[PDB]
Scaffold this active site. Structure first.
Site, mmCIF file in Angstrom:
data_model
loop_
_atom_site.group_PDB
_atom_site.id
_atom_site.type_symbol
_atom_site.label_atom_id
_atom_site.label_comp_id
_atom_site.label_asym_id
_atom_site.label_seq_id
_atom_site.Cartn_x
_atom_site.Cartn_y
_atom_site.Cartn_z
ATOM 1 N N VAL C 87 0.781 -1.271 0.152
ATOM 2 C CA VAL C 87 0.123 0.152 -0.029
ATOM 3 C C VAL C 87 0.715 1.560 -0.047
ATOM 4 C CG1 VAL C 87 -1.851 1.243 1.208
ATOM 5 C CG2 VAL C 87 -1.741 -1.263 1.389
ATOM 6 N N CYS C 88 0.476 2.090 -1.005
ATOM 7 C CA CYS C 88 1.143 3.586 -0.788
ATOM 8 C C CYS C 88 0.410 4.697 -0.633
ATOM 9 C CB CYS C 88 1.931 3.704 -2.172
ATOM 10 S SG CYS C 88 2.858 2.110 -2.815
ATOM 11 N N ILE C 89 0.556 5.355 0.480
ATOM 12 C CA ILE C 89 -0.130 6.522 0.988
ATOM 13 C C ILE C 89 0.693 7.280 1.784
ATOM 14 C CG2 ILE C 89 -2.649 5.729 1.289
ATOM 15 C CD1 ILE C 89 -2.370 4.386 3.678
#
Ligand SMILES: [Zn+2]
Ligand SMILES: [Zn+2]
Lengths: 27, 58, 156
Positions: C87-89
C-alpha cells in the site's frame, strides 16, 4: 489472557467476512 | 532544555510520541505538550509537529 | 518492553474495546506484536462495498517513529496499491507535504486513511498504473474490475 483474546479476534474476522458475504449477495 | 515545571507533566500524563508518562515535559510553539527526550528524537527525524503537519521555525 | 511494545499493546487493547464497523485488526500472536492481520470490509455505497480485504501489517522496532509495512494478502485493483500488494499512502510516508507519517498516527487512523482511499481512490503515488489510468480513462470498466475484486475477496 494469552489465547482468550486470540480466539475472540478470530471470531470477529470470521463473522465480519461471513456478514459481507450475506450482504453482498442479499444486495 | 526543560523550563516547564513538573506540574505540567502531572497535568498531561501522556505523550503522542512515546506515550506513557514522564516528568520532562515541554510546551511546543504550536501549543502541544511533548517530552524533551521525545522531541529530541523527532527533531532529528523531522521538524514538523505531528498534530500540526507544519514545520516549526522557532 | 520498549516504546513499540507498550504502544502496540495499547493500540490492540483499544481495537478490542471499541471496534469499528468492518474493521477487524490485531496481532497474529500474543508472543508476536510485530505481525498484525487486518480485515477491512469495504464500506457500503462504494465500488468495494462488502469487500472483506485481508491485509498484513508488519511493524518496525522503533515504532511509532517509523510507519508499519501494510501489504494486501489478496488481489487488488487500487491505483495506490502495488501489484505485489504494498500500500502506498502519504500517511505512511516516512521522512527518513501536507500528509506525512507522524507518531501521533495510530493504527486506527492508518486504517481510516485506507478505508477513505478505498471510497475515494486518489492516485497520488501511482503504484498500479493500470488502475490509475483506467480510473480517469474509463470509470465504467474500473467499477467492473473493482466489484470483481469483491467477489474474489469474499470468495464468491
Ligand atoms: Zn503541534
Ligand atoms: Zn514522551
Amino acid at each position: 489472557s494469552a489465547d482468550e483474546r486470540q480466539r475472540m479476534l478470530v471470531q470477529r474476522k470470521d463473522e465480519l467476512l461471513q456478514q459481507a458475504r450475506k450482504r453482498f449477495l442479499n444486495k | 532544555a526543560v523550563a516547564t515545571p513538573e506540574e505540567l507533566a502531572v497535568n498531561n500524563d501522556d505523550c503522542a510520541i512515546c506515550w506513557d508518562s514522564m516528568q520532562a515535559a515541554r510546551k511546543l510553539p504550536c501549543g502541544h505538550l511533548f517530552h524533551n527526550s521525545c522531541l529530541r528524537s523527532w527533531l532529528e527525524q523531522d521538524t514538523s509537529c505531528p498534530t500540526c503537519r507544519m514545520s516549526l521555525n522557532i | 518492553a520498549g516504546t513499540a511494545l507498550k504502544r502496540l499493546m495499547a493500540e490492540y487493547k483499544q481495537l478490542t474495546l471499541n471496534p469499528p464497523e468492518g474493521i477487524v485488526a490485531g496481532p497474529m500472536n500474543e508472543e508476536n506484536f510485530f505481525e498484525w492481520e487486518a480485515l477491512i470490509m469495504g464500506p457500503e455505497d462504494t465500488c468495494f462495498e462488502f469487500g472483506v480485504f485481508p491485509a498484513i501489517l508488519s511493524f518496525p522496532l522503533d515504532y511509532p517513529l517509523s510507519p508499519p509495512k501494510m501489504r494486501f494478502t489478496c488481489e487488488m485493483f487500487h491505483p495506490n496499491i502495488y501489484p505485489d500488494g504494498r500500500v502506498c499512502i502519504s500517511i505512511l510516508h516516512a521522512p527518513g507535504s501536507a500528509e506525512r507519517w507522524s507518531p501521533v498516527q495510530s493504527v486506527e487512523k492508518i486504517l481510516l486513511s485506507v478505508v477513505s482511499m478505498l471510497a475515494e481512490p486518489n492516485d497520488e503515488s501511482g503504484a498500479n498504473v493500470d488502475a490509475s489510468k483506467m480510473w480517469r480513462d474509463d470509470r465504467e470498466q474500473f467499477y467492473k474490475i473493482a466489484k470483481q475484486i469483491v467477489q474474489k475477496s469474499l470468495g464468491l
